[PDB]
C-alpha cells in the first residue's frame, strides 16, 4: 500500500588492519571489535565522522573466540581461549569485559567448568539478550564440525546460556535440528535474534574446492529451554546467498552475483531489490547491522581499512 526505500553510501577509514571485524550498535552509534594480528590486539573501535576511533585494547594483558552481547545500557564482551579441537580442556576459561559506555571496561576472568560444548565448533559473533519468560539470556552456541550419516546424537547444534549477564553459564538450551544433507561440514554458526525469536546463520560444505554455502534456519520454542529449528529457503538462481537480517517484520537478504561477489543484491521481503555495485572492488564479507525496525547498515571492507557503509531505510504499509 506504501513502500519506502532509501539508500546512502558513506566511507570509513581505519588506521588499523583488522583480520576480523565485528560490528555492533550501542546507544545509536557504530562500533567494531577489531582483531589485529601482524603482535596481537583486540581493539574496541567507534565510528566518529569518516573514521574508526580506537577506544580500548581488551588484549592489554591476558586468537580467542569473541562473544559480544549488547544490552540496552551494557556491553558484555567475552574473550574465550580455545585449544586444538582434538586436545581441549574440560573447563573453558574466558575474560569478561563489562562497560556502561564504549571506552572503559572491567576485566574479570571466568571459568565454565565441564562446559557442554567441548565437542562443538565455536565462532566469534555479536548477539542480543534472548528473553525467555522473565529471564534474559546470553547465548554461546556451537555446532558439530561434521555430521555423518551414522551420527549417534542427531542434534548438531548446542547452546550454553547465562542469565546473570555473563558470569555463569549453567543453562543448557536444546536446539532440535538435523541438516538435510547426509554428510556435511559446518562453519561459522552464529545465532540471529530478533524480537525474542531465535535463528541461526551458518555455512555448510563438503571439503570440495573451498565451497561454503550459507544456510539459515528459523527456530520456534518447543519448551522454555528447547527450540525446533528448520531450513528457510532463500535460494535464487545465479545468485549466492550471503547475509540475513529483518526489517519491518520481514527478511532482508543479501546475495552475491557469484562466489567472487563483484556486486551484491539486497531483497526486501523477496519483493523489492536494490543492487550494490562496488575504485574497483567487490562486496565479499557484506554484513547487515540492524539499527531499528526500519534502518540497517550493509558493510564490507575494500582496500585495507576502507569500509563501504550502505545505510538502508525500508518501510512497507
Amino acid at each position, epitope marked *: 500500500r506504501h513502500v519506502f526505500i532509501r539508500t546512502e553510501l558513506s566511507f570509513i577509514k581505519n588506521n588499523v588492519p583488522c583480520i576480523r571485524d565485528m560490528f555492533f550498535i550501542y546507544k545509536r552509534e557504530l562500533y567494531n571489535i577489531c582483531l589485529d594480528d601482524l603482535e596481537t590486539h583486540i581493539y574496541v573501535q567507534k565510528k566518529v565522522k569518516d573514521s574508526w576511533i580506537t577506544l580500548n585494547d581488551l588484549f592489554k594483558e591476558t586468537r580467542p573466540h569473541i562473544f559480544a552481547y549488547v544490552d540496552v545500557e551494557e556491553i558484555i564482551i567475552l574473550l574465550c581461549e580455545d585449544e586444538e579441537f582434538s586436545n581441549r580442556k574440560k573447563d573453558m576459561t574466558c575474560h569478561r569485559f563489562y562497560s556502561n559506555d564504549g571506552k572503559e571496561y572491567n576485566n574479570a576472568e571466568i571459568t565454565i567448568s565441564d562446559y557442554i560444548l567441548k565437542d562443538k565448533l565455536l565462532s566469534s559473533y555479536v548477539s542480543l539478550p534472548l528473553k525467555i519468560e522473565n529471564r534474559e539470556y546470553f547465548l554461546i552456541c556451537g555446532v558439530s564440525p561434521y555430521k555423518f550419516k551414522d551420527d549417534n546424537k542427531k542434534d548438531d547444534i548446542l547452546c550454553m546460556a547465562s542469565h546473570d549477564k555473563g558470569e555463569t553459564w549453567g543453562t543448557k538450551i536444546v536446539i532440535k535440528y538435523d541438516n538435510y544433507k547426509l554428510g556435511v561440514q559446518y562453519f561459522f554458526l552464529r545465532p540471529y535474534i530478533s524480537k525474542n525469536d531465535l535463528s541461526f546463520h551458518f555455512y555448510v560444505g*563438503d571439503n570440495i574446492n573451498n565451497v561454503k554455502n550459507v544456510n539459515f534456519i528459523e527456530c520456534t520454542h518447543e519448551k522454555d529451554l528447547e527450540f525446533v529449528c528448520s531450513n528457510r529457503d532463500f535460494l535464487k538462481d545465479n545468485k549466492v546467498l550471503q547475509d540475513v537480517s529483518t526489517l519491518n517484520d520481514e527478511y532482508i537478504v543479501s546475495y552475491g552475483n557469484d562466489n567472487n561477489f563483484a556486486e551484491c543484491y539486497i531483497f526486501f521481503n523477496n519483493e523489492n531489490s536494490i543492487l550494490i555495485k562496488p575504485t574497483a572492488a567487490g562486496c565479499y564479507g557484506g554484513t547487515f547491522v540492524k539499527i531499528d525496525e526500519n534502518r540497517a547498515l550493509f558493510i564490507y571492507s575494500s582496500s585495507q581499512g576502507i569500509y563501504n557503509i550502505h545505510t538502508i531505510y525500508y518501510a512497507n504499509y
Partner: antibody, heavy 116, light 111 residues
Framework: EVQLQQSGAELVKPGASVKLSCTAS????????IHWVKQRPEQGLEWIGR????????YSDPKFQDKATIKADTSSNTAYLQLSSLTSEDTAVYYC?????????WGAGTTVTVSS | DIVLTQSPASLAVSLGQRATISCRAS??????????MHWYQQKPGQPPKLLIS???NLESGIPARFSGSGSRTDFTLTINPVEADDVATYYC????????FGGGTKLEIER
C-alpha cells in the same frame, strides 16, 4: 533399499557427445552429492567431479577438463554426466557414487566405448 | 592437492596369512578429530565397494577380518586372516581436500 542405477552400455562415434544417467532408489539426491569417477581398462580410479543437487553447484577437477558437465534433476532423482567430443582417451567405465564424506553407494558402471 | 601413494603395487599372500596395504598422503588428511581416509575393494567387472571409512570405521556388512589403522598421512588396511574371496584391487581415498584415490594394490593368493 539404497541404490544407483546407471544407463545401459552405449556405442559413441568419435567426436560425438554422450549423456549418462545415474538414478537413485531409497534416497533423495538433494540430501547428498553425486560424484563421477572414470576408470580406464586396466587402470585405477580417477575422480571427475560432483554436483550438489540441492543448489546445482558443480565442481570438476581442473586437470580433468571441462569436457564433463555434471547435471541433476531432483524431480526424476537423476544425475547426469555429459561427456562431449569424446576421444579414445575417454573409453572408460564411468561410475557414479553418492558422497556422505566417503563413497558409500556406487553405481554398477556405464561402459563408454568410442566406436569408429 | 593431496596425492596418495600405495605400497605395495601388488601382494602375494597365502590363505590364513595377514596382508597389510599402506597408503601415504602428501598432506595431513585429518580434520577436527576425523581422519578422512577410506578403503575400497574392487573385483574385476564390478564397482569399488566401501570396506572402511574414516580410517578405522568398519562398514556394516564388511567382515571383521578387514581393519584400518592410521593417523595423519600414514594409513594401513589389514586383512587378517586372508580368505580366497579376498582376491581384488584395493584402493585408498581421501575426502579432506577434494577427492583423490591411491594407485591400487592387487591382492593375489598363493596356494
Amino acid at each position: 533399499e539404497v541404490q544407483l542405477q546407471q544407463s545401459g552400455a552405449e556405442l559413441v562415434k568419435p567426436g560425438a557427445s554422450v549423456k549418462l544417467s545415474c538414478t537413485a532408489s531409497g534416497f533423495n539426491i538433494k540430501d547428498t552429492y553425486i560424484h563421477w569417477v572414470k576408470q580406464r581398462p586396466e587402470q585405477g580410479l580417477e575422480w571427475i567431479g560432483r554436483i550438489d543437487p540441492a543448489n546445482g553447484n558443480t565442481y570438476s577437477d581442473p586437470k580433468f577438463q571441462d569436457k564433463a558437465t555434471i547435471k541433476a534433476d531432483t524431480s526424476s532423482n537423476t544425475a547426469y554426466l555429459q561427456l562431449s567430443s569424446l576421444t579414445s582417451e575417454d573409453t572408460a567405465v564411468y561410475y557414479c557414487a553418492r558422497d556422505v564424506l566417503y563413497f558409500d553407494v556406487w553405481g554398477a558402471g556405464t561402459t563408454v566405448t568410442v566406436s569408429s | 592437492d593431496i596425492v596418495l601413494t600405495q605400497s605395495p603395487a601388488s601382494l602375494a599372500v597365502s590363505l590364513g596369512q595377514r596382508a597389510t596395504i599402506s597408503c601415504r598422503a602428501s598432506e595431513s588428511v585429518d580434520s577436527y578429530g576425523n581422519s578422512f581416509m577410506h578403503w575400497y575393494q574392487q573385483k574385476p567387472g564390478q564397482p569399488p565397494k566401501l570396506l572402511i571409512s574414516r580410517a578405522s570405521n568398519l562398514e556394516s556388512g564388511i567382515p571383521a577380518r578387514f581393519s584400518g589403522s592410521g593417523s595423519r598421512t600414514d594409513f594401513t588396511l589389514t586383512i587378517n586372516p586372508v580368505e580366497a574371496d579376498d582376491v581384488a584391487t584395493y584402493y585408498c581415498q581421501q575426502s579432506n581436500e577434494d577427492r583423490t584415490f591411491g594407485g591400487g594394490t592387487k591382492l593375489e593368493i598363493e596356494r
